[PDB]
Amino acid sequence: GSSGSSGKKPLSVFKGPLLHISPAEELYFGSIESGEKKTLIVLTNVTKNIVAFKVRTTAPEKYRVKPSNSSCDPGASIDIIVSPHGGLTVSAQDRFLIMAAEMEQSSGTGPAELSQFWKEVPRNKVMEHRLRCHTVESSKPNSLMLSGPSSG
């Protein structure tokens, strides 16, 4: 008969006024590869100024988020890896957070300058973006399988 495997899905990002968040609000810990199941977040600084971003979560001592404290120059994209402990698994109640605040003119991107900027920048200016985890379960188009994109 007819059968296949895998499907497809669109990719959207939270168009932030300062720092962009990728993906928007959908984390999928599991790549097509049978290697590691870590998600990589992308932050596109649309602004023309430095933006200090920070990654948080309800369980930072479970998920390895790095960088979790840094900045992203204007007109550049950063990469934030998110790998869970090498024992447990991706939960559902688990939630991630990403901060982004526009810095002054010339501001470094260290543990100091930041600690300072995060001290000067008001929480009102601090843009927080909470991400969600799309726990993978029962991979199939609701019973049986059916999917065949444009191949060749």
Curated annotation (Swiss-Prot):
Residues the UniProt record annotates as site (Required for FFAT motif binding): V65
Compartmental location: Endoplasmic reticulum membrane
Site feature (Required for phosphorylated FFAT motif binding) residues: K54
Keywords from the UniProt entry: Chemotaxis, Endoplasmic reticulum, Membrane, Transmembrane, Transmembrane helix
Domain MSP: start-end pairs: 18-136
Keyword Zinc among record annotations: no
Domain of life the protein comes from: Eukaryota
Region span, Required for FFAT motif binding and phosphorylated FFAT motif binding: 56-57
Chief subcellular location: endoplasmic reticulum
Single biological process term from Gene Ontology: chemotaxis
Cysteines engaged in disulfide bonds, as pairs: none
Entry note about domains: The MSP domain is required for binding to the FFAT motif of target proteins. The CRAL-TRIO domain is necessary for the recruitment to lipid droplets (LDs) and mediates the formation of ER-LDs contacts through an amphipathic helix.
UniProt subunit comment: Homooligomer. Interacts (via MSP domain) with STARD3NL (via FFAT motif), RMDN3 (via FFAT motif), OSBPL1A (via FFAT motif) and CERT1 (via FFAT motif). Interacts (via MSP domain) with STARD3 (via phosphorylated FFAT motif); this interaction depends on the critical phosphorylation of STARD3 on 'Ser-209'. Interacts with RB1CC1 (via phosphorylated FFAT motif), MIGA2 (via phosphorylated FFAT motif) and OSBPL1A (via FFAT motif).
Role: Endoplasmic reticulum-anchored protein that mediates the formation of contact sites between the endoplasmic (ER) and endosomes, mitochondria or Golgi through interaction with conventional- and phosphorylated-FFAT-containing organelle-bound proteins. In addition, forms endoplasmic reticulum (ER)-lipid droplets (LDs) contacts through a direct protein-membrane interaction and participates in LDs homeostasis. The attachment mechanism involves an amphipathic helix that has an affinity for lipid packing defects present at the surface of LDs.
Protein name: Motile sperm domain-containing protein 2
Gene coding for it: Mospd2
Portion of the full-length sequence here: 317 to 455 of 518
